[PDB]
Subunit: 311 residues, 5 copies
């Protein structure tokens, strides 16, 4: 067929409802995620209307090819969704109740400023282009919106799955387009990051600082340079599970700032030795004793300065 | 057609049966696995009933398009299963015997607390949404449940493949949903982990402790710092074949605890040298001799404390 | 059917228009990118013409199988596009207004000479092969060309999406081919590259130069050789997120030039020690004091020489 | 249609024949491989029998949908095969000659005990489930079994492609199943392994042993610990192109045994120094001179012991 | 329909022609490459013949389902090609002019003996199996063979795309098979390999040789062992972008030979120190002075010997 004709001159309202069955594969570098969910559609098509008393059955099942169904599409998806139609029910007044189960790969940008303490807002944009004959608007049936209790996103906590009830209606290539915003709110599980990356990164740094309670250049150079190399291993490791951000990330700042604490430790160590060869173990030991406090203090100051700038 | 009508207000029981042909690709990070199996369905549709004497044939074959077949779906799957229909047999009383061979990628969370000594319980959730006209319930035909003797999951031992006989029946978008739980129990093969990761990780640690039977700071710093670097190589290697767990894993704890045994060894070595420059080889050698026992003992204490906390 | 016949002997003009919905996965090594966009086509087929007064409807919808549609194809694609037809509208004069939403993986070479400060010009080549009966030419409807305000290419800034209005018409396997050039202009977001790769690469180099304010060969060899090893880690890391270019890249040149500053630092350090064993701490300290300026100066000269040669 | 009925009470024999066109992607970790081959089937269906004089053609071509074709399936495959039908020829007596060209990813476990000198036996299990009306058995037409001479598996030698002529017939879910075993025998090409992994692994070990012709702890610790680190690089590299085996592999044993030769070298070096600080360069040099022979000898003994245990 | 019948007793000649639109993804390890090209077929089918005067049109278009089309297949492909039919033109005499645009993943072995100075000959084998009724032979229409001017294979130079005009005709499972050989000749772009791998690999080796102008064992051991470790990083890096070859590669030989120049440098350094402890700085300095020439000379001799053996 073709669209149901207006029963006045009114835009056709299509009622939507996404129900998350599964959430999986949140790819941080690609800024994508996969979803498996129910998509529930509902519209009024009077042409399909009937009498429950006459036909003796209060609901009518239909195969999708048989009736007019709106061309609903996802906006922020890599390829068109994979969908199997579950049910089509028509109530006496001509109300269609569409239900399909779909799966799709979704493009939603992530903000890494507060990584790995960051929280995200994933989006699923539902859309419909209107026909010449008829204008189409989307609406949210809040009863058919949700997620099941099990959905689990490896590595994240799931706060809420809600929808912006008012659609964004606009012209696109001389036709009306109705766009809905479904929002999945998530928070990163950062427990593992503390013993697996953060504390080791600090231990290797604190080991570099033992060159302040040592008079031997040879051993000091080894202490600082070897631990600096270990810090590079961690800088490379963490920047690889991350995309090319045009903004300073929080961990990125910490790591970068640490590169200076190794550089300045090399300066101190280079100085302490230079004075011993010039025969002033006098000020060499003053500098070495100063560094012992200066470094832990400046480090702790800087980390507070940064945490304040980012949280 | 449409569902078989009730003799009376009784829900339709659909008999299920999963038979594993192949198990493969248990992805630890993604918390998924692939399965290739038979799915056997069986229901009563009186409309299909016949006389063996009249039609002269005791069993009737049907093409799937011809008859009513329940919309059975897997819950915890990435995308809908890939299935080829094997056989449809109808017995005189109107009993349908459906058989399809399918393959699917299945989402089942794994518990890494006891990794790599962990055992898992994989799930395959079978489901059916009920129609307006008729309610549908799932049931387990225990004769059509199993796995063949060859199924092999690279890297794991397979205990049992059984099913929770009582379905979980619940409302979902104002309709009854019948859900079955098929359970594949597995245990990790950890033989390789001992010589390929655990013993090397300990050898590099024991090598770090030779700095207690040495008076030379330069060589001691080298011993401890070099082996610490080797330990980082193993920490990175094992945390990469693992996902971002919001709980302390057992190996994660061991590894993290080892990072301290390197840090404290650096403290001892830094101290032993500091006293020699202050001219008290007196207590320096007391500390060095104490460490020789303190470290192996505290290490062995801690490992018992941990194994007890996790097993 | 078959192509619309000419009124005289003029080739058939097909009006094109690409509208980018999404841009994603710019793979630098493969020199590809994925696109999700609208493709709008428009041609004159008099056979379809009608009377608005007689048929009582001013616009006619058609299913794609029903009418003649030109075989439009993308040139620089891995596989043929994935497309779902959105709308076909026929105006009284026989003007067809085709609209499909497609997604494709596109091959477009990138120039890495100025990497990571490089800017690119991606291409989408639209094409049509002509029939024996009729000649077909492509044209640009500039109103149906664009991108939405959200398109975001992880890791890049998007300047413009425009089209070369004049098609390239040529013979290919004894038939006319009409080719259009759609151009997506982009610029790389290089912020992260400075603290995550460039500054660390320089800090490790400046640390190598502390061997000029040191008289100890053992510590000097350690300083230079250890930092050289750290530089290899960065050379390998950056050449891996890059393809095998038959031209000198800018970062490639910097990195390569740095390999010499380590090699020549080893020469200096090897010399300084050799003279002290020959008992001329006389010129050894002249050379060491010269290097202190020579290296930072020559390095800064060279970097200017290079930046000038590339920008 | 449905199966051809029996003349008298004999099961239907289906003649099989796999002809390998290509072998590729033997994935060692996944224990899989891809195959591209011809599958030739042949059975008697009298219902199709015809007269060459009447129908005027001595052989009849048929489209697969038109006639009864047995549901032949591969057992040990990830997903169902990708197949394009080449030819269906029916001879006057009702003999069908089926030919399809397929491609599939096949699950076949590999034995890594003798890796990288190991040889494998890959399997392709052909199967057929029997109908209610008729029993089906598979058979091997040895003339339609083979591989072309050009067929190569990157990184491997192909001995033979043969089939176990006698099928394994058994009950599965109350029906007869006929299973055939096609065997591809292969041997690993290990040439590259000697200069790219084995000899370097030994050179780094022999370098560690130069600490026996040296009196300097500082240099000795460096020699042994640095080469131990290089050995870890090789242990990690080779265990990554390998799956998690619940059995000791041969290379796994060699590598593990080497970890001890580094550990015991550290003991010796730690001892030699300890005696020099205790002033017995007397026995220190006895031990050091003993090690010089003890290590190469014990190493060579152990390697023979191992090679004997595995070959 | 079925094949066109002969005019005598001559096999049917099918004229072929591959036209490369795109070449991409030359995977060195897998020994594959992707291709996007036109496939042009042409045969004589008299049944289709017509009169230009009577039907008034000199060419006839046909949909593929309507006429007999030969079953043309690629031999050395992973899976069957993805093809969209472009055009079918029938000239009055009954000459069919088939044209499809396809894309496929192609298996073609590469020879790594001269890597990274190697040149390759990729193959595309076109094939056709003959029917009982008729014999089919392939032929090359050299006008419909080529590549466009843009084809670019990231990382390679493309010499020529030509075809072996004489097909290889042979029996396969009691039927004639006609096989054509299309050859894509390529040469590796090795510019990047010199500054990104070769020169660094040599610089680290030349740095190891500075231990000949040094009397200090501790610093010498560091120089040689540290650079040896850096050489392992490069050996692992280059053998990973390479498959498991059962033949000595040229770079493989160079790398392996270098492993000896590090081993023998360790011998020299171990000797020079041993004589100093035995008090013969007499011959120690003779050996050290000899090595200074012996190493650069033997190295340069060996490289010439190798280049001669491989080029
Ligand atoms: C008294 C010494 C002060 C050092 C101050 C260093 C400032 C560095 C600023 C870098 C800014 C980016 C080119 C860097 C070479 C390393 C410097 C070696 C210092 C030598 C110490 C001599 C001790 C008398
Ligand atoms: C070394 C660096 C240490 C990192 C310190 C955490 C920064 C912080 O303060 O983190 C804050 C987050 C919560 O962030 P929020 O909920 O978004 O607060 C929003 C704040 N507004 C409303 C003011 C904008 O708490 C954590 O993760 C606490 C765990 C820290 C563990 C550190 C272990 C070492
Ligand atoms: C005798 C001193 C003991 C030091 C104890 C240090 C506790 C560290 C905290 C553990 C965290 C888990 C900030 C750390 C600086 C490095 C310590 C340098 C020690 C100097 C020794 C001087 C000998 C007189
Ligand atoms: C130091 C290195 C770490 C040692 C690891 C010990 C782990 C352990 O104690 O593991 C115990 C587990 C078995 O536990 P389970 O079968 O799952 O009991 C579950 C049943 N419940 C629920 C009733 C408790 O496996 C082992 O015995 C592994 C052998 C370890 C060999 C280590 C050699 C060195
Ligand atoms: C005193 C003059 C130093 C000459 C340095 C040689 C530069 C070689 C340039 C190679 C360019 C690529 C071939 C390199 C050999 C090792 C160099 C050993 C240096 C010994 C210094 C002795 C101190 C008197
Ligand atoms: C290590 C070497 C440091 C890199 C030096 C910058 C390269 C450059 O000069 O880059 C310049 C480009 C901009 O180039 P453009 O404007 O697009 O081209 C203009 C072409 N003209 C000249 C023909 C008009 O990027 C930048 O502004 C980079 C700023 C990076 C700061 C790095 C701090 C360390
Ligand atoms: C001669 C003493 C040999 C000791 C051997 C130790 C075997 C350990 C077995 C582990 C099982 C795998 C605590 C362990 C530290 C290493 C031992 C340091 C030795 C000091 C030498 C003193 C010389 C008088
Ligand atoms: C590291 C230590 C060196 C490894 C020693 C190789 C083991 C071996 O000797 O391996 C033997 C295998 C072949 O054994 P098979 O074909 O299975 O015959 C088994 C038949 N039986 C059961 C009757 C005995 O390797 C080879 O052909 C030898 C290649 C060795 C090259 C290594 C150079 C260094
Ligand atoms: C005189 C030194 C000759 C060196 C010969 C070495 C042959 C090694 C064969 C390896 C085969 C691949 C076992 C190797 C130990 C290292 C050698 C230590 C040298 C001691 C120097 C003594 C000075 C008089
Ligand atoms: C240290 C390793 C240095 C590598 C030396 C190149 C080997 C070679 O000699 O390479 C030679 C090949 C040329 O091969 P071809 O002419 O096409 O052979 C076909 C002709 N026949 C049949 C007569 C053999 O490559 C080159 O021109 C190499 C350029 C090398 C630059 C590297 C500088 C350092
Ligand atoms: Cl969609
Ligand atoms: Cl499913
Ligand atoms: Cl409920
Ligand atoms: Cl209900
Ligand atoms: Cl296309
Ligand atoms: Cl199959
Ligand atoms: Cl093909
Ligand atoms: Na419809
Ligand atoms: Na049905
Ligand atoms: Na059409
Ligand atoms: Na059939
Ligand atoms: Na055809
Ligand atoms: Na050192």
């Amino acid at each position: 067929v073709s669209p149901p004709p207006p029963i006045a001159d009114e835009p056709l309202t299509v009622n939507t409802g996404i129900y998350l069955i599964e959430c999986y594969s949140l790819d941080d570098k690609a800024e994508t995620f996969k979803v498996n969910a129910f998509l529930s559609l509902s519209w009024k098509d009077r042409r399909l209307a009937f009498d429950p008393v006459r036909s003796g059955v209060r609901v009518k099942t239909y195969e999708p090819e048989a009736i007019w169904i709106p061309e609903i599409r996802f906006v922020n998806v890599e390829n068109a969704r994979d969908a199997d139609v579950v049910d089509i029910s028509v109530s006496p007044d001509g109300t269609v109740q569409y239900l399909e189960r779909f799966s799709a790969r979704v493009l939603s940008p992530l903000d890494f400023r507060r990584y790995p303490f960051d929280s995200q807002t994933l989006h699923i944009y539902l859309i419909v282009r209107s026909v010449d004959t008829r204008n189409i608007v989307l609406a949210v049936d809040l009863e058919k919106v949700g997620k099941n209790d099990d959905v689990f996103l490896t590595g994240w906590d799931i706060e809420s799955f809600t929808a912006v009830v008012k659609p964004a209606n606009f012209a696109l290539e001389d036709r009306l387009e109705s766009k809905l915003d479904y929002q999945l709110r998530i928070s990163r599980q950062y427990f593992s990051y503390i013993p697996n990356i953060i504390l080791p990164m600090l231990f290797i740094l604190f080991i570099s600082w033992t060159a302040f309670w040592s008079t031997s250049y040879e051993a000091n150079v080894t202490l600082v340079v070897s631990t600096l190399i270990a810090h590079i291993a961690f800088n490379i490791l963490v920047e690889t599970n991350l995309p090319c951000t045009p903004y300073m990330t929080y961990t990125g700042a910490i790591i970068f700032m640490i590169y200076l604490f190794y550089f300045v430790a090399v300066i101190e160590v280079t100085v302490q030795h230079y004075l011993k060869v010039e025969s002033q173990p006098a000020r060499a030991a003053s500098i070495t004793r100063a560094s012992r406090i200066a470094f832990p203090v400046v480090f702790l100051l800087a980390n507070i300065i940064l945490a304040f700038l980012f949280f």
